[PDB]
Amino acid sequence: ADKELKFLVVDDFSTMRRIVRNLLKELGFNNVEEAEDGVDALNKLQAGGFGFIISDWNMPNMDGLELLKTIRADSAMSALPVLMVTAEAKKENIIAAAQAGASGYVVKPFTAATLEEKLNKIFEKLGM
Amino acid sequence: QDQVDDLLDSLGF
C-alpha cells in the first residue's frame, strides 16, 4: 500500500491517538490526522483525501460502531478501509463489527508488529 | 478463547 496513504485515527483519548499515530509512523505511515469521536471524525473526513480509518469502539457523541456504519452507508466513502479497536475480544462485539463491515478488528493495547499484521491483512483483501 | 480465535479467523480479522 502507498506510504502516503492518509489515515484518520479516531479515539476520545488523546494519549491512545498519539500512540497509534506513533505506531503508524514506526511503520512508515506519516500522513496521519486525528479525531476525538465519530462526529469530529465525519467532520474531518469532509476535507477529503482520507484513505484509511482506525477507530476506537467506545466514544461519546458517536461511537465506533456508529461511525463505521455511517462510513459504510455513505455514498463517497462506503469502501474506505476501517480498522476497529476494542478493549476486549467478545463474540458479541466481533460479530457486531463483522455485520457492520469492519475491514479489521484489533484489541488494544497492541504492538507495531500486530498493527502491521492487521493493516497487511486488510491491504491484501482489498488488493492495496 | 477458542471460539473467539476461530471466529476471528473465519472473519479474516
PDB file of C-alpha atoms in Angstrom:
ATOM      1  CA  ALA A   1       0.000   0.000   0.000  1.00  0.00           C
ATOM      2  CA  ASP A   2       1.164   3.571  -0.545  1.00  0.00           C
ATOM      3  CA  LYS A   3       3.316   5.071   2.194  1.00  0.00           C
ATOM      4  CA  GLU A   4       1.431   8.379   1.801  1.00  0.00           C
ATOM      5  CA  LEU A   5      -1.993   6.821   2.456  1.00  0.00           C
ATOM      6  CA  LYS A   6      -3.838   9.299   4.695  1.00  0.00           C
ATOM      7  CA  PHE A   7      -5.063   7.795   7.953  1.00  0.00           C
ATOM      8  CA  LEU A   8      -7.595   9.175  10.384  1.00  0.00           C
ATOM      9  CA  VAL A   9      -7.087   7.925  13.937  1.00  0.00           C
ATOM     10  CA  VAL A  10     -10.254   8.183  15.995  1.00  0.00           C
ATOM     11  CA  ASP A  11     -10.347   7.931  19.778  1.00  0.00           C
ATOM     12  CA  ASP A  12     -11.599  10.267  22.524  1.00  0.00           C
ATOM     13  CA  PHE A  13      -8.394   9.590  24.488  1.00  0.00           C
ATOM     14  CA  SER A  14      -5.595  11.793  23.240  1.00  0.00           C
ATOM     15  CA  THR A  15      -2.831   9.515  24.516  1.00  0.00           C
ATOM     16  CA  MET A  16      -4.116   6.468  22.634  1.00  0.00           C
ATOM     17  CA  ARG A  17      -4.418   8.587  19.471  1.00  0.00           C
ATOM     18  CA  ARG A  18      -0.799   9.669  19.867  1.00  0.00           C
ATOM     19  CA  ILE A  19       0.262   6.077  20.493  1.00  0.00           C
ATOM     20  CA  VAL A  20      -1.478   4.814  17.354  1.00  0.00           C
ATOM     21  CA  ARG A  21      -0.118   7.720  15.306  1.00  0.00           C
ATOM     22  CA  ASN A  22       3.367   6.864  16.584  1.00  0.00           C
ATOM     23  CA  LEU A  23       2.944   3.164  15.725  1.00  0.00           C
ATOM     24  CA  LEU A  24       1.828   4.194  12.241  1.00  0.00           C
ATOM     25  CA  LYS A  25       4.924   6.379  11.933  1.00  0.00           C
ATOM     26  CA  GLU A  26       7.033   3.432  13.050  1.00  0.00           C
ATOM     27  CA  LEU A  27       5.595   1.510  10.101  1.00  0.00           C
ATOM     28  CA  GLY A  28       6.392   4.337   7.661  1.00  0.00           C
ATOM     29  CA  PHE A  29       2.892   5.884   7.521  1.00  0.00           C
ATOM     30  CA  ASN A  30       3.453   9.599   8.220  1.00  0.00           C
ATOM     31  CA  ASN A  31       0.232  11.045   6.746  1.00  0.00           C
ATOM     32  CA  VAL A  32      -1.973  10.795   9.838  1.00  0.00           C
ATOM     33  CA  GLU A  33      -4.655  13.044  11.295  1.00  0.00           C
ATOM     34  CA  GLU A  34      -6.752  12.657  14.450  1.00  0.00           C
ATOM     35  CA  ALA A  35     -10.408  12.944  15.518  1.00  0.00           C
ATOM     36  CA  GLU A  36     -11.819  12.679  19.063  1.00  0.00           C
ATOM     37  CA  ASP A  37     -15.126  10.933  18.247  1.00  0.00           C
ATOM     38  CA  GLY A  38     -17.400   9.881  15.383  1.00  0.00           C
ATOM     39  CA  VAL A  39     -18.793  13.361  14.896  1.00  0.00           C
ATOM     40  CA  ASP A  40     -15.409  15.032  14.843  1.00  0.00           C
ATOM     41  CA  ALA A  41     -14.260  12.230  12.517  1.00  0.00           C
ATOM     42  CA  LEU A  42     -17.054  12.725   9.991  1.00  0.00           C
ATOM     43  CA  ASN A  43     -16.358  16.453  10.062  1.00  0.00           C
ATOM     44  CA  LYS A  44     -12.668  15.983   9.244  1.00  0.00           C
ATOM     45  CA  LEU A  45     -13.441  13.362   6.599  1.00  0.00           C
ATOM     46  CA  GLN A  46     -15.221  16.120   4.676  1.00  0.00           C
ATOM     47  CA  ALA A  47     -11.813  17.617   3.823  1.00  0.00           C
ATOM     48  CA  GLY A  48     -11.413  14.588   1.558  1.00  0.00           C
ATOM     49  CA  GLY A  49      -8.332  12.590   0.657  1.00  0.00           C
ATOM     50  CA  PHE A  50      -8.557  10.102   3.527  1.00  0.00           C
ATOM     51  CA  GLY A  51      -7.622   6.518   2.678  1.00  0.00           C
ATOM     52  CA  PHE A  52      -7.812   4.611   5.947  1.00  0.00           C
ATOM     53  CA  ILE A  53      -9.656   4.831   9.259  1.00  0.00           C
ATOM     54  CA  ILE A  54      -8.658   3.414  12.629  1.00  0.00           C
ATOM     55  CA  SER A  55     -11.385   3.885  15.216  1.00  0.00           C
ATOM     56  CA  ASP A  56     -11.944   3.011  18.817  1.00  0.00           C
ATOM     57  CA  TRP A  57     -15.166   1.221  19.760  1.00  0.00           C
ATOM     58  CA  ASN A  58     -16.344   3.453  22.632  1.00  0.00           C
ATOM     59  CA  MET A  59     -16.590   7.222  22.169  1.00  0.00           C
ATOM     60  CA  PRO A  60     -19.116   9.924  23.120  1.00  0.00           C
ATOM     61  CA  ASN A  61     -21.432  11.716  20.676  1.00  0.00           C
ATOM     62  CA  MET A  62     -20.918   8.917  18.145  1.00  0.00           C
ATOM     63  CA  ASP A  63     -19.122   5.691  18.947  1.00  0.00           C
ATOM     64  CA  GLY A  64     -17.024   3.430  16.716  1.00  0.00           C
ATOM     65  CA  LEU A  65     -19.823   1.175  15.516  1.00  0.00           C
ATOM     66  CA  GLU A  66     -21.966   4.187  14.706  1.00  0.00           C
ATOM     67  CA  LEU A  67     -19.086   5.762  12.782  1.00  0.00           C
ATOM     68  CA  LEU A  68     -18.360   2.519  10.907  1.00  0.00           C
ATOM     69  CA  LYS A  69     -21.974   2.066   9.787  1.00  0.00           C
ATOM     70  CA  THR A  70     -22.152   5.713   8.671  1.00  0.00           C
ATOM     71  CA  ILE A  71     -18.987   5.362   6.591  1.00  0.00           C
ATOM     72  CA  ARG A  72     -20.194   2.066   5.080  1.00  0.00           C
ATOM     73  CA  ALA A  73     -23.564   3.555   4.107  1.00  0.00           C
ATOM     74  CA  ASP A  74     -22.053   6.823   2.802  1.00  0.00           C
ATOM     75  CA  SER A  75     -22.095   7.399  -0.956  1.00  0.00           C
ATOM     76  CA  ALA A  76     -18.479   8.594  -1.217  1.00  0.00           C
ATOM     77  CA  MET A  77     -16.630   6.563   1.453  1.00  0.00           C
ATOM     78  CA  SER A  78     -18.520   3.238   1.605  1.00  0.00           C
ATOM     79  CA  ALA A  79     -15.387   1.290   0.629  1.00  0.00           C
ATOM     80  CA  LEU A  80     -12.941   3.070   2.968  1.00  0.00           C
ATOM     81  CA  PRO A  81     -10.821   0.637   4.986  1.00  0.00           C
ATOM     82  CA  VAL A  82     -11.797   0.773   8.663  1.00  0.00           C
ATOM     83  CA  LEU A  83      -9.857  -0.924  11.434  1.00  0.00           C
ATOM     84  CA  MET A  84     -11.824  -1.215  14.641  1.00  0.00           C
ATOM     85  CA  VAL A  85     -10.142  -1.175  18.043  1.00  0.00           C
ATOM     86  CA  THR A  86     -11.735  -2.573  21.198  1.00  0.00           C
ATOM     87  CA  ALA A  87     -10.658  -3.142  24.775  1.00  0.00           C
ATOM     88  CA  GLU A  88     -11.692  -6.796  24.755  1.00  0.00           C
ATOM     89  CA  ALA A  89     -12.394  -9.507  22.198  1.00  0.00           C
ATOM     90  CA  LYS A  90     -16.002 -10.580  22.767  1.00  0.00           C
ATOM     91  CA  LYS A  91     -18.123 -12.698  20.440  1.00  0.00           C
ATOM     92  CA  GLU A  92     -20.887 -10.080  20.500  1.00  0.00           C
ATOM     93  CA  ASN A  93     -18.629  -7.145  19.558  1.00  0.00           C
ATOM     94  CA  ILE A  94     -16.719  -9.175  16.946  1.00  0.00           C
ATOM     95  CA  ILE A  95     -19.969 -10.233  15.276  1.00  0.00           C
ATOM     96  CA  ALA A  96     -21.238  -6.641  15.508  1.00  0.00           C
ATOM     97  CA  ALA A  97     -18.089  -5.443  13.745  1.00  0.00           C
ATOM     98  CA  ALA A  98     -18.477  -8.146  11.088  1.00  0.00           C
ATOM     99  CA  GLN A  99     -22.116  -7.245  10.368  1.00  0.00           C
ATOM    100  CA  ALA A 100     -21.209  -3.537  10.018  1.00  0.00           C
ATOM    101  CA  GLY A 101     -18.342  -4.174   7.580  1.00  0.00           C
ATOM    102  CA  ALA A 102     -15.241  -3.593   9.710  1.00  0.00           C
ATOM    103  CA  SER A 103     -12.186  -4.194   7.495  1.00  0.00           C
ATOM    104  CA  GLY A 104     -10.166  -5.338  10.518  1.00  0.00           C
ATOM    105  CA  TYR A 105     -10.577  -5.851  14.260  1.00  0.00           C
ATOM    106  CA  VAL A 106      -7.860  -5.466  16.907  1.00  0.00           C
ATOM    107  CA  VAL A 107      -7.686  -5.465  20.712  1.00  0.00           C
ATOM    108  CA  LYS A 108      -5.772  -2.663  22.448  1.00  0.00           C
ATOM    109  CA  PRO A 109      -3.134  -2.404  23.575  1.00  0.00           C
ATOM    110  CA  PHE A 110      -1.313  -3.732  20.513  1.00  0.00           C
ATOM    111  CA  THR A 111       2.246  -3.609  19.199  1.00  0.00           C
ATOM    112  CA  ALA A 112       3.525  -2.133  15.965  1.00  0.00           C
ATOM    113  CA  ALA A 113       4.057  -5.690  14.694  1.00  0.00           C
ATOM    114  CA  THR A 114       0.399  -6.513  15.365  1.00  0.00           C
ATOM    115  CA  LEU A 115      -0.767  -3.264  13.765  1.00  0.00           C
ATOM    116  CA  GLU A 116       1.354  -4.122  10.736  1.00  0.00           C
ATOM    117  CA  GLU A 117      -0.188  -7.604  10.537  1.00  0.00           C
ATOM    118  CA  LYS A 118      -3.717  -6.187  10.695  1.00  0.00           C
ATOM    119  CA  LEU A 119      -3.046  -3.488   8.084  1.00  0.00           C
ATOM    120  CA  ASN A 120      -1.447  -6.043   5.759  1.00  0.00           C
ATOM    121  CA  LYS A 121      -4.420  -8.397   6.021  1.00  0.00           C
ATOM    122  CA  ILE A 122      -6.692  -5.505   5.038  1.00  0.00           C
ATOM    123  CA  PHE A 123      -4.430  -4.334   2.189  1.00  0.00           C
ATOM    124  CA  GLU A 124      -4.309  -7.898   0.843  1.00  0.00           C
ATOM    125  CA  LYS A 125      -8.082  -8.377   0.950  1.00  0.00           C
ATOM    126  CA  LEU A 126      -8.623  -5.044  -0.849  1.00  0.00           C
ATOM    127  CA  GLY A 127      -5.780  -5.526  -3.335  1.00  0.00           C
ATOM    128  CA  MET A 128      -3.951  -2.499  -1.962  1.00  0.00           C
TER     129      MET A 128
ATOM    130  CA  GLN B   1     -10.866 -18.023  23.558  1.00  0.00           C
ATOM    131  CA  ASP B   2     -11.315 -20.972  21.261  1.00  0.00           C
ATOM    132  CA  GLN B   3     -14.469 -19.709  19.581  1.00  0.00           C
ATOM    133  CA  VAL B   4     -13.228 -16.089  19.658  1.00  0.00           C
ATOM    134  CA  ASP B   5      -9.959 -17.049  17.963  1.00  0.00           C
ATOM    135  CA  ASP B   6     -11.872 -19.230  15.498  1.00  0.00           C
ATOM    136  CA  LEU B   7     -14.470 -16.564  14.888  1.00  0.00           C
ATOM    137  CA  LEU B   8     -11.727 -14.031  14.155  1.00  0.00           C
ATOM    138  CA  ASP B   9     -10.011 -16.375  11.695  1.00  0.00           C
ATOM    139  CA  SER B  10     -13.319 -17.122   9.989  1.00  0.00           C
ATOM    140  CA  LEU B  11     -13.912 -13.353   9.511  1.00  0.00           C
ATOM    141  CA  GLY B  12     -10.366 -12.747   8.315  1.00  0.00           C
ATOM    142  CA  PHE B  13      -9.643 -10.488  11.297  1.00  0.00           C
TER     143      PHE B  13
END
